[PDB]
Design a protein around this nucleic acid. Structure first.
Lengths: 98, 151, 206, 138, 97, 49
RNA sequence: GACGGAGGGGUACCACCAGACGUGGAGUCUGCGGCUCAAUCUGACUCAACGCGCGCACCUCACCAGGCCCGGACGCGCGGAGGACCGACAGCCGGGCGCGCUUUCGCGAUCGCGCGGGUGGUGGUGCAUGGCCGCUCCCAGCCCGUGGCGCGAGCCGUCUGCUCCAUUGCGACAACGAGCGAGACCCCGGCCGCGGGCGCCGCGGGACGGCCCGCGGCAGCGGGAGGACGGCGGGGCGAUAGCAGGUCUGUGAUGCCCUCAGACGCCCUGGGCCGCACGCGCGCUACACUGGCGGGGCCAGCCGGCGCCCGCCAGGACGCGCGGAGCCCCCGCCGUGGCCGGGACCGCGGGCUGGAACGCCCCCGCGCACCAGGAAUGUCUUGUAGGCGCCCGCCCCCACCGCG
């Protein structure tokens, strides 16, 4: 059975290692090539000032969300083996699907 | 319409041998040459029929620089997606010239068609990047700011 | 080629704002144990918080039940399964180098009413000893007067601008409360030796 | 290819004339006293407008190839801006009831097929669009 | 003066005594706290009013049964030892428990 | 006072942190004060650049 | 140190030059002033106030006209079980809510009262403050340690030279070494690979004043070339010392302070911020034919849903996952006429959103000024000005707004 895997990482460097680990754990289970979802840019522009006094300077805050595409043809136990096998780094999105 | 897998998705089989591109002002064009009877079509529309009627001459400049012999055998299929009307005619010209260059690229004869075309018109071969700038706060444009009331 | 309604992104957002609510609860909860960095990773409805801290003993304690009661409190608040909320507290090296501990220590030292210059001068020493080349302490407010002023006591060279500033500085802001009024203390600690890389302009040429 | 080689506007005007003689469409009563679009405040002065529009809907469906898109998509193709406001001008879509009443009429005459969702040019209709283009070619 | 129900008073006390965890989001009269269920005299397990519960939250704070660490518009209460003994007496519960 | 208290129904969207009912900025589902967001957007991971 | 209608050097479209396209003059929009009202809530006023504090029917909301209610916690003294507290049928009053009254059914210590101490507040003071921004500050400035110099305050370094854009360098010197700011970094872009796939997106190189020629110790200067790219992009971060600049009305940031049970607490209803002789600031639409008209072609990007019928529309019913501008281009038409420009106001209707228009949308009307704008002024040099559309924020509805 083939299971869909999606990983969302805010920091590109933190997901960069995770994608390298994903190939080095599921190679026998034939993990899919890591297509990268186009960045989802969460953008908030807020006036920098607590008040509205002074020039209207704007504070731009952006969270870039990166996502990767993975599929593994393996047993029900085998995805769980890769889920334990992949490098665990904190604050990551883990997806198990059918 | 922006740099997707659209480049090869339009045609299945009918393999084209020479691939070329022409991209300016966000208008990107992918040109595929099967080297048949020499006819050129852009976006399913024959190159001799171009939507701007004055800008058919701009599109037919690569063809005007070299003799009929070069285009006698080069069958080009072009696909321009995105950008704008004028950025699409400008893109077409760049792609047609990349197609002639790709036919004679291995020989030192690539130099002859690059010199003649470029000398008559710059950007026939090259593509001037000139991308659009970003609006900044306090203005309606990158170089334009709102009128100042006092002083 | 897809339906653009992926809610994975929205879930990611609610874990970030959970840490952000936690970061503030832990600040009220553990000013005694020097709460500092917090991260959260939940794999499959597991939930694990790594609180890098100055001291984990007040957080944990006998039977690690103080930690457990805090874990229950958040399991109830975030409506997660009770006891499913799990936290591991780690002791941090170079207590002086992390300024969230140093600013916390200063604010509480200032309360005992010690000399304000002496307070900063003692904190300045423990950061330089911990290795920070740049140490900056600024206390501002109505200090020993009915008028505002800012008193910067600084030992060493600190970068103040640019991309290195974001990763090579430890600015921590705390708001002391006093009968006169709030006299906020700000401590910024700069480490060129951050081990994450080198200063962009530092040419070793050895 | 065939109709694509022909200038689409030239083909649209010539085919609309053919559709009227061929009895295709047969314009409804409401179309004489109606102005296409919420943006246009003036009715078309062409008097053959419901035929010129009907060449546009069926030939644009030929351009769909296999899309099977609906009436609102075609309405967007003929949309323009609403003026007459102190506020700046904004694009408003064409009136759907006119567009619905030609795509339904074309399917009713079997020139179009409702495969799923909207409509794509029927094989019987596919000959008609190519046929007229061949007449234009010579 | 609020006629706070004894059932709602005891169930909240047990929830705090057992979990040392009560989290009360700021709320007005409308709405019901999620996580507490009380027996009606009509024999029904229900959800208690946020207002009555709020006065229980304030009675335990004014007793000293809890420690307040309010953050981000959410109250945070941990049971205190002096309160731990007190809750047992009201709930008719034992020290060994 | 059961009828009087809170008879009127309306959205009362406020910042999660402050409770102010103005500038809620729920653009991405964040019920966040614009002034309060300025205070704590670093933990949410938003970066200035 | 600051000033000079002092001298010499630089330098910047928030300076000018050559220009551009505007404003000011008209109609409207929004803000500000005044005026007026029960209230028309307020901040604030040269740059650095004036569509600014991110969409006021209600809520917001702070203002006003009312109307409930306590949510005064705990302690202490005192009171309390057939009752501490309270809740309601009808009738009436009051828009109305056993609010309250006539009254008479319920109800259960949850607590009544006096004192200490709460409790809140968009009440005040930003001349008590923190934090945060604005501005000084298209500006390169700031500064130890040791040595020198003066009784010292203070100088020297930290420079009357030449170069940069730049305390950018180079060269010389009672300085000699540093440091921070500059720069560097970072974010994107255009280019070229290496891999990957549902998604064009992960990782790297590529440009450095190198090369050529002149000129200068030099720093560098000005041309050429070679190349996507050439010599401060298009951003972010922005030292030091400050300003009684602004914000206590963003908050469980806050002192002092004020109210606190007929509350300056909170809810509920109705109004106000949008009232208009008038002055001004930011805008939007104009003044037509380099146009309106409107029948087709047709291309977007931040990035993105549609189908089927019903309806002139506006919308709606019904199901499903889908899917893309204007300008311009051609062809008609009107023909220099306040006209076929302009759409401000007004009168019938038809929808929508909500609990409610007093909101918006549309259809038929209606046809105000306005025929290129005085003194003044405002921002700009490549994908730039301008023209032209679109998206989101705040949003129930709604953008002439902001950010894109």
């Amino acid at each position: 059975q083939k299971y869909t895997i999606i990983v969302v990482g805010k920091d590109l460097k933190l997901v960069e290692r995770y994608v390298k680990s994903i190939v080095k754990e599921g190679r026998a289970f034939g993990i899919s090539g890591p297509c990268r979802a186009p960045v989802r840019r969460l953008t908030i522009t807020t006036r920098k000032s607590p008040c509205g006094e002074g020039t209207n300077t704007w504070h731009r805050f952006e969270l870039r969300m990166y996502k990767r595409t993975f599929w593994v043809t393996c047993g029900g136990n085998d995805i769980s083996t890769i889920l334990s096998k992949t490098v665990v780094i904190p604050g990551i999105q883990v997806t198990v699907e059918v | 319409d922006l740099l997707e897998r659209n480049d090869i998705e339009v045609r299945e089989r009918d393999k084209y041998t020479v691939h070329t591109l022409g991209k300016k002002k966000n208008s990107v064009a992918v040109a595929f040459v099967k080297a048949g009877k020499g006819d050129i079509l852009v976006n399913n529309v024959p190159l001799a029929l171009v939507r701007p009627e004055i800008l058919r001459t701009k599109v037919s400049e690569p063809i005007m620089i070299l003799g009929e012999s070069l285009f006698k055998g080069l069958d080009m299929n072009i696909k321009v997606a995105g950008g704008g009307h004028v950025s699409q005619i400008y893109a077409v010209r760049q792609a047609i010239s990349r197609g002639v260059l790709a036919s004679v690229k291995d020989e030192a004869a690539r130099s002859e068609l690059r010199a003649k075309l470029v000398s008559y018109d710059r950007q026939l071969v090259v593509s001037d990047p000139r991308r659009c700038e970003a609006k900044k706060f306090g203005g309606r444009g990158a170089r334009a700011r709102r009128q100042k009331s006092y002083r | 080629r897809r339906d653009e309604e992926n809610v994975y992104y929205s879930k990611y957002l609610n874990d970030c704002i959970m840490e952000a609510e936690l970061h503030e609860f832990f600040s009220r909860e553990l000013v005694d144990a020097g709460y500092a960095s917090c991260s959260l990773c939940r794999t499959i409805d597991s939930i694990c918080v790594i609180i890098q801290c100055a001291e984990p003993e007040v957080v944990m304690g006998d039977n690690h039940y103080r930690l457990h009661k805090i874990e229950y409190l958040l399991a109830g608040r975030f409506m997660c399964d009770p006891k499913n909320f799990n936290i591991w507290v780690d002791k941090i090296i170079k207590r002086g180098l992390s300024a969230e501990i140093m600013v916390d220590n200063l604010r509480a030292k200032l309360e005992e009413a010690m000399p304000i210059r002496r307070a900063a001068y003692s904190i300045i020493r423990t950061a330089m000893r911990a290795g920070a080349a740049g140490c900056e302490v600024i206390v501002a407010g109505k200090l020993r007067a009915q008028r505002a002023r800012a008193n910067k006591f600084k030992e060493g060279c600190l970068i103040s601008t640019g991309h290195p500033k974001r990763i090579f500085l430890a600015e921590a802001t705390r708001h002391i409360k006093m009968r006169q009024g709030v006299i906020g203390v700000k401590v910024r600690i700069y480490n060129p030796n951050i081990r994450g890389a080198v200063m962009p302009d530092k040419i070793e040429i050895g | 290819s065939s109709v694509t080689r022909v200038p689409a506007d030239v083909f649209i005007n010539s085919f609309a004339a053919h559709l009227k003689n061929r009895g295709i469409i047969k314009c409804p009563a409401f179309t004489d006293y109606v102005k296409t679009g919420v943006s246009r405040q003036y009715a078309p002065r062409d008097a053959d407008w419901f035929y010129i529009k009907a060449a546009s809907v069926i030939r644009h469906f030929y351009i769909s190839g296999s899309h099977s898109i609906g009436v609102a998509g075609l309405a967007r193709k003929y949309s323009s801006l609403q003026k007459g406001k102190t506020t700046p001008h904004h694009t408003k879509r064409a009136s759907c009831k006119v567009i619905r009443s030609i795509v339904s009429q074309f399917l009713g005459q079997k020139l179009l097929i409702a495969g799923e969702r909207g409509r794509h040019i029927s094989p019987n209709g596919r000959k008609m669009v190519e046929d007229f283009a061949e007449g234009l070619q010579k | 003066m609020v006629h706070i129900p004894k059932a709602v008073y005891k169930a909240v006390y047990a929830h705090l005594y057992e979990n040392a965890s009560l989290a009360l989001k700021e709320y007005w009269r409308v709405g019901n706290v999620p996580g507490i269920t009380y027996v009606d005299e009509n024999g029904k397990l229900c959800n208690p009013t946020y207002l009555h519960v709020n006065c229980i939250m304030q009675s335990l704070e004014s007793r000293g049964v809890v420690k307040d660490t309010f953050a981000w518009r959410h109250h945070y209460y941990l049971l205190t030892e002096k309160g731990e003994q007190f809750i047992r007496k009201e709930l008719d519960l034992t020290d060994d428990v | 006072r059961e009828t009087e208290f809170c008879t009127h129904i309306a959205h009362k969207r406020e910042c999660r942190i402050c409770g102010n009912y103005n500038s809620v900025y729920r653009k991405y589902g964040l019920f966040i004060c614009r002034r309060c967001f300025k205070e704590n957007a670093g933990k949410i991971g938003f970066v200035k650049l």
